[PDB]
CSV table of C-alpha atoms and ligand atoms in Angstrom, one decimal:
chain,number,residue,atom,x,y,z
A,1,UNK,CA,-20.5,-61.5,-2.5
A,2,UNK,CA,-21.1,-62.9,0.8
A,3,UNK,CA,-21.3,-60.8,4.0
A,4,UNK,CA,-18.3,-61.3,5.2
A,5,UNK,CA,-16.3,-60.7,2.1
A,6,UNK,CA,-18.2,-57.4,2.2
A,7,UNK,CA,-17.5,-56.7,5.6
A,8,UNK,CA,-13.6,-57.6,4.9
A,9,UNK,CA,-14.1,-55.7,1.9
A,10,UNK,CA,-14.8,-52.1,3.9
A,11,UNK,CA,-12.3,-52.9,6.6
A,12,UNK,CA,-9.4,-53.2,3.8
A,13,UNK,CA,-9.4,-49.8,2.9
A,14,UNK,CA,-6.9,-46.9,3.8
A,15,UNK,CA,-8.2,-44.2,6.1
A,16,UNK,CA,-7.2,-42.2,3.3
A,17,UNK,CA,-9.2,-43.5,0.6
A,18,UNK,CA,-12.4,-40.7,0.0
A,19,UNK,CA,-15.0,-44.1,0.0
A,20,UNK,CA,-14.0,-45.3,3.1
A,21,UNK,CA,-16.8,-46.2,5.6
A,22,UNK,CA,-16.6,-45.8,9.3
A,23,UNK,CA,-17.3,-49.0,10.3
A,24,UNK,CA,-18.6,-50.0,14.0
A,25,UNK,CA,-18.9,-53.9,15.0
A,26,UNK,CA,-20.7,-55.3,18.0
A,27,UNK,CA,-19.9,-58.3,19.6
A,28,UNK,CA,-22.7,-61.3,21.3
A,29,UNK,CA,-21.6,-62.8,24.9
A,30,UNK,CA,-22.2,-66.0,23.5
A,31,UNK,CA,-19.1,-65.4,20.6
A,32,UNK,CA,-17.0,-64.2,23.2
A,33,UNK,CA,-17.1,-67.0,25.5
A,34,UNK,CA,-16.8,-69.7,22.6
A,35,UNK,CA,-14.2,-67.9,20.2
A,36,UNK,CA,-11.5,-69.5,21.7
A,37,UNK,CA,-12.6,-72.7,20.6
A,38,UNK,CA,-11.8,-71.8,17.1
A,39,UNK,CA,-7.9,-72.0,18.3
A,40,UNK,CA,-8.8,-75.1,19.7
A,41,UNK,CA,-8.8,-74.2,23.4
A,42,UNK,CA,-11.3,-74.4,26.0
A,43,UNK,CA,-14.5,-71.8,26.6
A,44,UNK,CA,-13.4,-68.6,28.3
A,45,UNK,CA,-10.0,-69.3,27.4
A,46,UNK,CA,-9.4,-65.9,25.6
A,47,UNK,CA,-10.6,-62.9,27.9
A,48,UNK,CA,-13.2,-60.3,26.3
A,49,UNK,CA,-10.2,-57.3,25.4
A,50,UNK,CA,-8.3,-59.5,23.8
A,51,UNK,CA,-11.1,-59.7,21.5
A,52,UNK,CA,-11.4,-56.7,21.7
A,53,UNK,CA,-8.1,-55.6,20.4
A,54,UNK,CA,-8.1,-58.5,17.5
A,55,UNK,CA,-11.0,-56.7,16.1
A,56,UNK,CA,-9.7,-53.7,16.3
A,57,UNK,CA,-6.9,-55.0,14.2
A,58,UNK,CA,-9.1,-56.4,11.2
A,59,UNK,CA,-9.5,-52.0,11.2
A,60,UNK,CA,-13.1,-51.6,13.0
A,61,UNK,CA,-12.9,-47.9,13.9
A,62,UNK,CA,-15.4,-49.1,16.9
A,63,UNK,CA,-16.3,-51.9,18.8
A,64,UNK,CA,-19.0,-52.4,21.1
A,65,UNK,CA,-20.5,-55.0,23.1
A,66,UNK,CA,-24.0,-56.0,22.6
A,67,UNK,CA,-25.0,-55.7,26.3
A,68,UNK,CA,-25.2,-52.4,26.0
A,69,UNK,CA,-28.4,-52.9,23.3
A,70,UNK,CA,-29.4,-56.0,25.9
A,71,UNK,CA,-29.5,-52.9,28.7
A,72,UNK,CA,-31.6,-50.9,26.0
A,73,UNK,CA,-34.4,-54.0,25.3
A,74,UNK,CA,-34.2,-54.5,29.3
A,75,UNK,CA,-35.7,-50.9,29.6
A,76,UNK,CA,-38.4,-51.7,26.9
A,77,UNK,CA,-39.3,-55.2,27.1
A,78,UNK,CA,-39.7,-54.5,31.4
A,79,UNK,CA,-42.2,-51.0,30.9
A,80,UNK,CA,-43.9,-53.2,28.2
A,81,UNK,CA,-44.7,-56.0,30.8
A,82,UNK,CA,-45.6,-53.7,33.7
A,83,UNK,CA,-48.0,-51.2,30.9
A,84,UNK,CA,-49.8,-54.5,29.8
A,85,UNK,CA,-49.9,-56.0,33.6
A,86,UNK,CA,-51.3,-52.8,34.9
A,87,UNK,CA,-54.0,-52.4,31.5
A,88,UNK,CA,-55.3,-56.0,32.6
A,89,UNK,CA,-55.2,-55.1,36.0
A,90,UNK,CA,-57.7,-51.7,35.8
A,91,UNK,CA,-59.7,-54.2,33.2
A,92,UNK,CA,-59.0,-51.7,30.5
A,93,UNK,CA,-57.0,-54.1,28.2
A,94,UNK,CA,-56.0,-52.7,24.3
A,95,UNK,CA,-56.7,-55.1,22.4
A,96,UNK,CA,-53.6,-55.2,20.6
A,97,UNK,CA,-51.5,-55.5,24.0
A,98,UNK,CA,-52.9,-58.5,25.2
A,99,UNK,CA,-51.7,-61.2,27.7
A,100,UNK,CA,-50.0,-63.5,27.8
A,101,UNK,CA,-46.7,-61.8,26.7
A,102,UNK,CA,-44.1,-63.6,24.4
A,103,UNK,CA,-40.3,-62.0,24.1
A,104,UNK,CA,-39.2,-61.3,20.4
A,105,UNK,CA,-35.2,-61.9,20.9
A,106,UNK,CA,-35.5,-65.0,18.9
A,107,UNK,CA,-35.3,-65.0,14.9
A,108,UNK,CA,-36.0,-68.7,15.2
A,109,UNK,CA,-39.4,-67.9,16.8
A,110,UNK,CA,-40.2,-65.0,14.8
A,111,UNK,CA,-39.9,-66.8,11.4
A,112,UNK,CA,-42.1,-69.4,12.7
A,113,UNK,CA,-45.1,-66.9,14.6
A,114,UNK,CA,-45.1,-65.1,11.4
A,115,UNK,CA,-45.7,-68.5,9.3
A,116,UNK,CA,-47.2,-71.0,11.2
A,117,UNK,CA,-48.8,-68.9,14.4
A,118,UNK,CA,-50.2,-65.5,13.0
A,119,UNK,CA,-53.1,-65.7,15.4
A,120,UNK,CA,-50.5,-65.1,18.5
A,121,UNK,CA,-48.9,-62.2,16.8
A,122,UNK,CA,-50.5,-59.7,19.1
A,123,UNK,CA,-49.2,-61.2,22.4
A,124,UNK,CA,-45.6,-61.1,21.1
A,125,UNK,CA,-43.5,-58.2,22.5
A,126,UNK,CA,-42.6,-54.9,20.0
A,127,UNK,CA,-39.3,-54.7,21.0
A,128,UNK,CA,-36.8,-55.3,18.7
A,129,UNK,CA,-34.0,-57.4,19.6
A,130,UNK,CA,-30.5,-56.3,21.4
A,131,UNK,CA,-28.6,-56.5,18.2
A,132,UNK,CA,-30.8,-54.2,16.5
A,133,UNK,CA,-31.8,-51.7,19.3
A,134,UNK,CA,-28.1,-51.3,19.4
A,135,UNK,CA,-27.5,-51.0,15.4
A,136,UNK,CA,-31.0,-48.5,15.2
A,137,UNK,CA,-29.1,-45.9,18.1
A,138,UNK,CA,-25.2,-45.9,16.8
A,139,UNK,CA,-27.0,-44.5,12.9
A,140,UNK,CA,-29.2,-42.3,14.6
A,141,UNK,CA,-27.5,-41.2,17.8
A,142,UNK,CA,-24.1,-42.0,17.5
A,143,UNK,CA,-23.7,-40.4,13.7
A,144,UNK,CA,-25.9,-37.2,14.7
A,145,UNK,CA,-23.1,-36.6,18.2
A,146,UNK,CA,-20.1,-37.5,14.8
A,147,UNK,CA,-21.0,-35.1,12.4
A,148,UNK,CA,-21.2,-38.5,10.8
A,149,UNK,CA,-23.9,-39.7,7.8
A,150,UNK,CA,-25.4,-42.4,8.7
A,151,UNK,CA,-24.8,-43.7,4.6
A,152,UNK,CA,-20.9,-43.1,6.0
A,153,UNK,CA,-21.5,-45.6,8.8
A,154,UNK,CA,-21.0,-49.7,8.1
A,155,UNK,CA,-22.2,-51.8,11.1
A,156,UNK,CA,-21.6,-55.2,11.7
A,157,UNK,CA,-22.3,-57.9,14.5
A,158,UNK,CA,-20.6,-61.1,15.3
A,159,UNK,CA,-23.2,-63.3,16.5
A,160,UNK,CA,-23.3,-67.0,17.6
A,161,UNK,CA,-26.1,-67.4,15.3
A,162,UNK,CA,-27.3,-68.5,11.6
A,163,UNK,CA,-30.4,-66.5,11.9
A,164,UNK,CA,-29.6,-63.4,12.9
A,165,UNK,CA,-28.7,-61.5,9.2
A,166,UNK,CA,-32.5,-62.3,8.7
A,167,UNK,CA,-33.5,-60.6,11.3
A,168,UNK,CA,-31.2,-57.4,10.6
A,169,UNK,CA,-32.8,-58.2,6.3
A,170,UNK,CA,-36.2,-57.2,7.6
A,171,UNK,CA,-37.0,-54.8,5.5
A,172,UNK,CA,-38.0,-51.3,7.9
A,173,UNK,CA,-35.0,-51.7,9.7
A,174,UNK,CA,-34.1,-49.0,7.1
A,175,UNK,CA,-33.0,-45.4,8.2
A,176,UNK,CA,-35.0,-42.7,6.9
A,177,UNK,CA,-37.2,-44.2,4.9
A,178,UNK,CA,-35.3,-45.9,2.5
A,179,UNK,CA,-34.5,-49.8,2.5
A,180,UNK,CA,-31.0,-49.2,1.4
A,181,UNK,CA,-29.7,-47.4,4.5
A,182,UNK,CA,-30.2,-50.2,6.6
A,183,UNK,CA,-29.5,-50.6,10.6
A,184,UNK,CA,-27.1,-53.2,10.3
A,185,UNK,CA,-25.5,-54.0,7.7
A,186,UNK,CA,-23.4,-57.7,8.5
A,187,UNK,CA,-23.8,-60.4,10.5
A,188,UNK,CA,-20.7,-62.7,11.0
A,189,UNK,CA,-21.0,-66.2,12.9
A,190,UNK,CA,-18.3,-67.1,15.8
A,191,UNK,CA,-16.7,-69.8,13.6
A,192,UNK,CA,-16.3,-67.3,10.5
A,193,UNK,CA,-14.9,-64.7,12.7
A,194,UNK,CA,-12.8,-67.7,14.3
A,195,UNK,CA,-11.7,-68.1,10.7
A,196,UNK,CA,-11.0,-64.8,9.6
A,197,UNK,CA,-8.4,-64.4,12.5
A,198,UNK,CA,-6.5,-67.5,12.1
A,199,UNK,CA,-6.3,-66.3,8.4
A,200,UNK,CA,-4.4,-63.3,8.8
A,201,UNK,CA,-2.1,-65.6,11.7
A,202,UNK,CA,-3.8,-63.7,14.8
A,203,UNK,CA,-4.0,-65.7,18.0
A,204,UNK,CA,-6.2,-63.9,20.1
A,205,UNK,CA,-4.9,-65.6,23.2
A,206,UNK,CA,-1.1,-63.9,22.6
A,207,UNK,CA,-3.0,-60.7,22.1
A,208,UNK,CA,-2.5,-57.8,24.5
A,209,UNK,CA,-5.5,-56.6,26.4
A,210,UNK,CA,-7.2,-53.5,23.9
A,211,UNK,CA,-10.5,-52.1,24.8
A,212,UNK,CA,-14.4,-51.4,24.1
A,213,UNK,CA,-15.8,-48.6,23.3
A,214,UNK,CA,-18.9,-47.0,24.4
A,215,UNK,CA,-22.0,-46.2,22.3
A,216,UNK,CA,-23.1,-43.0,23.6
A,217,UNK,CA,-19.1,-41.7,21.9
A,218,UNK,CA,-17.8,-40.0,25.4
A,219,UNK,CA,-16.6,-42.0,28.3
A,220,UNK,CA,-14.0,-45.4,28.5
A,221,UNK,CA,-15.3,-48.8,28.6
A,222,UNK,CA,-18.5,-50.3,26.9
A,223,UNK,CA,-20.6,-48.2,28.4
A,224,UNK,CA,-22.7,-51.0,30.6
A,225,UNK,CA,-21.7,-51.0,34.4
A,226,UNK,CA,-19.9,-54.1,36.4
A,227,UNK,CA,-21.9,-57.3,37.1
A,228,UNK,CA,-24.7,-59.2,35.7
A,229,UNK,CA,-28.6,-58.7,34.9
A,230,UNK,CA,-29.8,-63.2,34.3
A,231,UNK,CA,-30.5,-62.1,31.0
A,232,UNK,CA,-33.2,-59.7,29.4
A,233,UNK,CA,-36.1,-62.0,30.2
A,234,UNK,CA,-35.1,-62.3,34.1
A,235,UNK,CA,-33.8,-58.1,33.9
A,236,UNK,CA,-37.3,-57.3,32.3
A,237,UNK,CA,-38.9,-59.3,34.9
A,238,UNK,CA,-37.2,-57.9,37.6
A,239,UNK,CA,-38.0,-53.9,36.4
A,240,UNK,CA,-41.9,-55.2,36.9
A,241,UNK,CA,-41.7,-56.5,40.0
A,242,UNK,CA,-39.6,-53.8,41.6
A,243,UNK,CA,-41.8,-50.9,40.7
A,244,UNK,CA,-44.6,-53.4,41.5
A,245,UNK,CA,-43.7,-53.8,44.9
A,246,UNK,CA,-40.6,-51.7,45.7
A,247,UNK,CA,-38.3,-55.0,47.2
A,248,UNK,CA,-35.6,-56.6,45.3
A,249,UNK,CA,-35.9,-59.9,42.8
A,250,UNK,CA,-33.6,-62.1,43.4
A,251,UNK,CA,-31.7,-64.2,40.8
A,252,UNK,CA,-34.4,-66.6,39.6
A,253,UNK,CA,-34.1,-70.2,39.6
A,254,UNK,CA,-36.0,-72.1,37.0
A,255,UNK,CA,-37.6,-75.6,37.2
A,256,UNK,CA,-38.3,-78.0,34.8
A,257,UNK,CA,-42.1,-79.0,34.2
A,258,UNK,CA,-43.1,-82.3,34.4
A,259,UNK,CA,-44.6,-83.5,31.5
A,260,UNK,CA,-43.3,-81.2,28.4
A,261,UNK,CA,-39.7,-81.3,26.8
A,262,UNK,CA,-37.5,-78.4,27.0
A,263,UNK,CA,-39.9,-76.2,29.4
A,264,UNK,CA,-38.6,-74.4,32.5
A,265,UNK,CA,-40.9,-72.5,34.6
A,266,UNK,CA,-41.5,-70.1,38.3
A,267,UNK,CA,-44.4,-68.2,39.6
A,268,UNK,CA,-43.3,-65.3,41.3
A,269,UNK,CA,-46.1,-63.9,44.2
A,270,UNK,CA,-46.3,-59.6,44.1
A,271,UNK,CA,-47.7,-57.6,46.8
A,272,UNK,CA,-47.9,-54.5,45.6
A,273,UNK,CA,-45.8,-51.6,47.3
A,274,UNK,CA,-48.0,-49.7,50.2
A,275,UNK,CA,-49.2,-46.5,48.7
A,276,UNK,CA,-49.2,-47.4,45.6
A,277,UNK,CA,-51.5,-47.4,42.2
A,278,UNK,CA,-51.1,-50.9,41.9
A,279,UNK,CA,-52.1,-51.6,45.4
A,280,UNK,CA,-55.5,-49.2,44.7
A,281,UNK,CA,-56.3,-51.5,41.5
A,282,UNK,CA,-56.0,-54.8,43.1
A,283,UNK,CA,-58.6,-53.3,45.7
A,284,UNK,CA,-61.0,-52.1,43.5
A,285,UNK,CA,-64.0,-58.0,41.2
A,286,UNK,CA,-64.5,-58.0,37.6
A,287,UNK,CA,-61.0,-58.3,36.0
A,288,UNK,CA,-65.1,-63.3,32.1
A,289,UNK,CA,-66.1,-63.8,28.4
A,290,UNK,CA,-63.5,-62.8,25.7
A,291,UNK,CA,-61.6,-63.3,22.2
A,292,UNK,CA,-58.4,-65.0,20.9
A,293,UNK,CA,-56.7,-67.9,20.6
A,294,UNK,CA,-55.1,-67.4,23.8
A,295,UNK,CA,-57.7,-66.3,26.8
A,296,UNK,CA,-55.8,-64.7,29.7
A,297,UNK,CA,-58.2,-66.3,33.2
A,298,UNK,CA,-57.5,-63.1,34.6
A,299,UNK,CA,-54.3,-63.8,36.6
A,300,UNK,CA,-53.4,-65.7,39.3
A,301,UNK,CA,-54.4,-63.6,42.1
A,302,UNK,CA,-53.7,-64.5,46.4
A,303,UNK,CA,-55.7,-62.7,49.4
A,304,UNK,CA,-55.0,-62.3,53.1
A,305,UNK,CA,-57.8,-61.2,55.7
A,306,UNK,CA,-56.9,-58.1,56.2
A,307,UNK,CA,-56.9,-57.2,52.6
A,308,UNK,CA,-53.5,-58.1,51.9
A,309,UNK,CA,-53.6,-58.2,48.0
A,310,UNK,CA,-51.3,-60.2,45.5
A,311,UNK,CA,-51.0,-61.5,42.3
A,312,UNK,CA,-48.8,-64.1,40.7
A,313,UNK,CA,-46.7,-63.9,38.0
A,314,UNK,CA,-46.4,-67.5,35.9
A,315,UNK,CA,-43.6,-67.6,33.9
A,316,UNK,CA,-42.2,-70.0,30.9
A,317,UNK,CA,-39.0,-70.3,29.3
A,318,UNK,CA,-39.2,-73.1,25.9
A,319,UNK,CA,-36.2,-74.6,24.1
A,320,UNK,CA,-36.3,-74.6,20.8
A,321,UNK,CA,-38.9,-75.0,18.5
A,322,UNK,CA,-40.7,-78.3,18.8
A,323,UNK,CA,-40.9,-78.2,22.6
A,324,UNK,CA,-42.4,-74.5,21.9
A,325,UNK,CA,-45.2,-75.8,19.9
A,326,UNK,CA,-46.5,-78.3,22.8
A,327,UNK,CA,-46.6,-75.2,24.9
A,328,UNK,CA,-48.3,-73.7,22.3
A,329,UNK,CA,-51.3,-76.5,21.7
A,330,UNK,CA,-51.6,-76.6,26.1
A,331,UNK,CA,-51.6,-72.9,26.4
A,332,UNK,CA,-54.1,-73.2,23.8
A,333,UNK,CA,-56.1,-75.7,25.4
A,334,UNK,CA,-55.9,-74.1,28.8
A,335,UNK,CA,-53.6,-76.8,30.4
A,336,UNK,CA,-50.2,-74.6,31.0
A,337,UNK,CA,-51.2,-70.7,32.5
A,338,UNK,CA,-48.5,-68.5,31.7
A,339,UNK,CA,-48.4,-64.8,31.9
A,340,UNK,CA,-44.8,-64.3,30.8
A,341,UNK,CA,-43.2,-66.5,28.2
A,342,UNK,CA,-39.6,-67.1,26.7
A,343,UNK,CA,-39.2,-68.9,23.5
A,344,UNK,CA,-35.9,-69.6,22.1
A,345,UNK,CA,-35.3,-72.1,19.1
A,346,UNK,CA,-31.8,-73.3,20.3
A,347,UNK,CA,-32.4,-76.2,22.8
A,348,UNK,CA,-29.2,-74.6,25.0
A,349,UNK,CA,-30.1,-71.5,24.0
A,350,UNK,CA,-27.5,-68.9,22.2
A,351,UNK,CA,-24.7,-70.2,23.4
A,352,UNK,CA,-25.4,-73.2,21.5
A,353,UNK,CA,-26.1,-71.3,17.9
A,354,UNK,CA,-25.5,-73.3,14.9
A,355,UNK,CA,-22.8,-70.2,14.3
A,356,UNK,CA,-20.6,-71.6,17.2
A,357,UNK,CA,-17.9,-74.4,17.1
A,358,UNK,CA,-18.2,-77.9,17.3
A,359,UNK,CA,-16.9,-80.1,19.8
A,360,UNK,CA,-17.3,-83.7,21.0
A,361,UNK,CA,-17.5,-82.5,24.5
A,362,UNK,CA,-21.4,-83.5,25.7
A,363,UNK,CA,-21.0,-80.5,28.1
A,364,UNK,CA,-19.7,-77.8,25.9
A,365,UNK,CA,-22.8,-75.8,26.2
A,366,UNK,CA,-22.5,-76.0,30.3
A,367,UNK,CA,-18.5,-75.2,29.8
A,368,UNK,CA,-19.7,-72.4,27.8
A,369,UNK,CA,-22.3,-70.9,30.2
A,370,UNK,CA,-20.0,-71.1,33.3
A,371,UNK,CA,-17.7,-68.7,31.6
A,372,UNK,CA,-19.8,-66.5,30.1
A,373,UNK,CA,-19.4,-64.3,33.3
A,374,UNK,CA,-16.2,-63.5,35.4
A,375,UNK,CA,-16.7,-64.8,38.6
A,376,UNK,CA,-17.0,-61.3,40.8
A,377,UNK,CA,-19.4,-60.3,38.3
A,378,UNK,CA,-21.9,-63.1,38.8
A,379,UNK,CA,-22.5,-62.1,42.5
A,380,UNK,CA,-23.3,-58.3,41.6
A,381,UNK,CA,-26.4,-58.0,40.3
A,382,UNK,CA,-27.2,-55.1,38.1
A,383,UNK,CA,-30.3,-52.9,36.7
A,384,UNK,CA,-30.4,-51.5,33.4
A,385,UNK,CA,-32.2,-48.2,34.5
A,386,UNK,CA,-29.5,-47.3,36.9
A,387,UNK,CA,-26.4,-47.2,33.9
A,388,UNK,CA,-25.9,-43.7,33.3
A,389,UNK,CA,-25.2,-44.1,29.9
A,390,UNK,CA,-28.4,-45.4,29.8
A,391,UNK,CA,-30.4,-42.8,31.5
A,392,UNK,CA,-28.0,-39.9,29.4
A,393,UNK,CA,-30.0,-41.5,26.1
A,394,UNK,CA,-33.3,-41.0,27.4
A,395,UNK,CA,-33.1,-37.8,29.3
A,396,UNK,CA,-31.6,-36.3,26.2
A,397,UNK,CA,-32.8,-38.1,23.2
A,398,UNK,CA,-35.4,-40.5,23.7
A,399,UNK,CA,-38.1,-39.1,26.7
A,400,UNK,CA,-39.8,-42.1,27.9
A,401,UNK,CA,-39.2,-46.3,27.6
A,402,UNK,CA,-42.3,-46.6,25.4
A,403,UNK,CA,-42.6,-43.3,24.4
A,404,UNK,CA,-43.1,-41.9,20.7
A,405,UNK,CA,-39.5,-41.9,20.1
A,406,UNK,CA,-38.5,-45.2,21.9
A,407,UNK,CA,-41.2,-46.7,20.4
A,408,UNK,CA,-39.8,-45.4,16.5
A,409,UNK,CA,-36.4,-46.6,17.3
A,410,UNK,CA,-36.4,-50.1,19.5
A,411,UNK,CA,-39.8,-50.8,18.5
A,412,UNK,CA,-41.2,-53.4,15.7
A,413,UNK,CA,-43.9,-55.3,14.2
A,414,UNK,CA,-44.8,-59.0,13.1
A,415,UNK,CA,-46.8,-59.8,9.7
A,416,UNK,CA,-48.7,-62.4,9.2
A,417,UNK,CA,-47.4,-65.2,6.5
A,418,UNK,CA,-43.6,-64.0,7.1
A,419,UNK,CA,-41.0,-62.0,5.1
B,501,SF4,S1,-30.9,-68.7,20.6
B,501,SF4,FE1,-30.2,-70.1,19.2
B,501,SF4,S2,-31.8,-69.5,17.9
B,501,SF4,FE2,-32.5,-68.1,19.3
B,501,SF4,S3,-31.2,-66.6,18.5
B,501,SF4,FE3,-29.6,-67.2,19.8
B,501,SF4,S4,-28.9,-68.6,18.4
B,501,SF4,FE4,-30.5,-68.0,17.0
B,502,ARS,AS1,-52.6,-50.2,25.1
B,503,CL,CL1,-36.9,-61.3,13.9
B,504,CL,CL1,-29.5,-59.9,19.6
């Protein structure tokens, strides 16, 4: 049986029955924007409760939006950059944390690392994606604050991609310890879901507005706060550079580099904050000669006269795969610096997944990104590490971003030759 029919499977039985499953789903950005397609409207044209309440009537018993595990990899993937940043900047790198730093969001890129690059394996982050940060809390949080076994618990998430089921079929993303319990369960495209609905004659955009519900199980909403973060890569970013040099990061504007296909790039100049540790490191020359494939120079640092110290930050977003691999080669070679680097194997990015609709429109992908976000919410810029949901999960369950139990729940590896 496919996924789905297993998935539609669970959902189809009574409350009452004694086998019945609770079963939680979780829901992409990128779906929710484009799932109005599937009725043959435009992007957007179908507002997130509405989905919300059409899921809720295929008999989820949760649903959840996958920001909330994007807030969760925010917290990780932005302590991960500053821990490494600040190891190369006392020259006291470990050797398994080197720079430059790759994100790991990207099944696409994973698959090929593991088979084609497994030399760069230790610059790739060890978080694990927002799907599955997400998935890896509701069966160990969630169930524990339910009374609920996590074997009781069925978890799927509507994603706008083909790849992601492989990611969740990696095999450790098992719960204690055996491969059969594991995280999440079912991934369903946008177009299957699209399908599903128009089966069973629901049209989301006649539904009435329903609601999310949160992860942490106390509380409305979804849990995440109004207004938007750029994305994990920019939010991540933007956690460095604030406790780097205590002022704000602006929404980051990316520009194409001349030369290579699909590559977008800034540089982003950080004085540290007076006072600080990371102003007493940049103070006190030698930060020469060492291994791997890719050699960090030692960072782009700036000086002033009166002692003013900086350092800049060189960062690279690549879409998809073959553009990637160029990058690759000139990183490589020592033509392209980069500290900080994106990969995605989409050329538009998620919200042009081979799980999303087809349309003749050139621009759909642009449609799609202008709606992705409510207007109001675009202008407010929001920080993971200020959600109090959020901060409830670490000061009562997890300690630390990077700490022993962060690091057994978000955290993953990469094996050389692939899966
Ligand atoms: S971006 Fe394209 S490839 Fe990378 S994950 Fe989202 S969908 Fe799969
Ligand atoms: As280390
Ligand atoms: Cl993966
Ligand atoms: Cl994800």
């Amino acid at each position: 049986l496919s996924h789905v029919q297993q998935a539609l499977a669970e959902l189809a039985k009574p409350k009452d029955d004694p086998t019945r499953k609770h079963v939680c789903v979780q829901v992409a950005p990128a779906v929710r924007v484009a799932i109005a397609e599937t009725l043959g409207l435009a992007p957007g044209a179908t507002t997130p409760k509405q989905l919300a309440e059409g899921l809720r009537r295929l008999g989820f018993d949760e649903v959840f939006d996958t920001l909330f595990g994007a807030d969760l990899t925010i917290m990780e993937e932005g302590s991960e950059l500053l821990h490494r940043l600040t190891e190369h900047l006392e020259a006291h790198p470990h050797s398994d944390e080197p720079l430059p730093m790759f994100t790991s969001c990207c099944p696409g890129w994973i698959a090929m690392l593991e088979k084609s690059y497994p030399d760069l394996i230790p610059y790739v982050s060890s978080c694990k994606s927002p799907q599955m940060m997400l998935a890896a809390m509701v069966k160990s949080y969630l169930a524990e604050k339910k009374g609920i076994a996590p074997k009781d618990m069925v978890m799927v998430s509507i994603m706008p991609c083909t790849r992601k089921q492989s990611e969740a079929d990696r095999d450790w993303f098992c719960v204690d310890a055996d491969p059969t319990l594991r995280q999440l369960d079912h991934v369903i495209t946008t177009v299957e879901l699209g399908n599903i609905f128009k089966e069973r004659g629901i049209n989301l955009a006649e539904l009435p507005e329903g609601e999310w519900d949160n992860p942490m199980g106390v509380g409305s909403g979804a849990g995440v706060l109004f207004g938007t973060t750029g994305g994990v890569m920019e939010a991540a970013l933007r956690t460095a550079y604030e406790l780097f040099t205590g002022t704000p990061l602006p929404r980051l504007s990316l520009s194409e580099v001349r030369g290579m296909d699909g590559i977008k790039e800034t540089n982003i100049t950080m004085v540290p904050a007076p006072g600080s540790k990371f102003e007493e490191l940049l103070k006190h020359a030698a930060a020469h000669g060492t291994p791997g494939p890719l050699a960090w120079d030692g960072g782009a640092g700036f000086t002033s006269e009166d002692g003013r110290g900086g350092i800049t930050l060189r960062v690279a977003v690549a879409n998809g795969l073959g553009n990637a691999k160029k990058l690759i080669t000139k990183m490589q070679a020592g033509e392209a610096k980069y500290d900080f680097v994106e990969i995605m194997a989409c050329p538009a990015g998620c919200v042009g997944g081979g799980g999303q609709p087809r349309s003749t429109d050139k621009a759909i992908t642009q449609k799609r990104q202008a709606a992705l976000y409510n207007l109001d919410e675009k202008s407010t810029l929001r920080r993971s590490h200020e959600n109090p949901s959020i901060r409830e999960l670490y000061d009562t369950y997890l300690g630390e971003p990077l700490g022993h139990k962060a690091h057994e729940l978000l955290h993953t590896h990469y094996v050389a030759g692939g899966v």
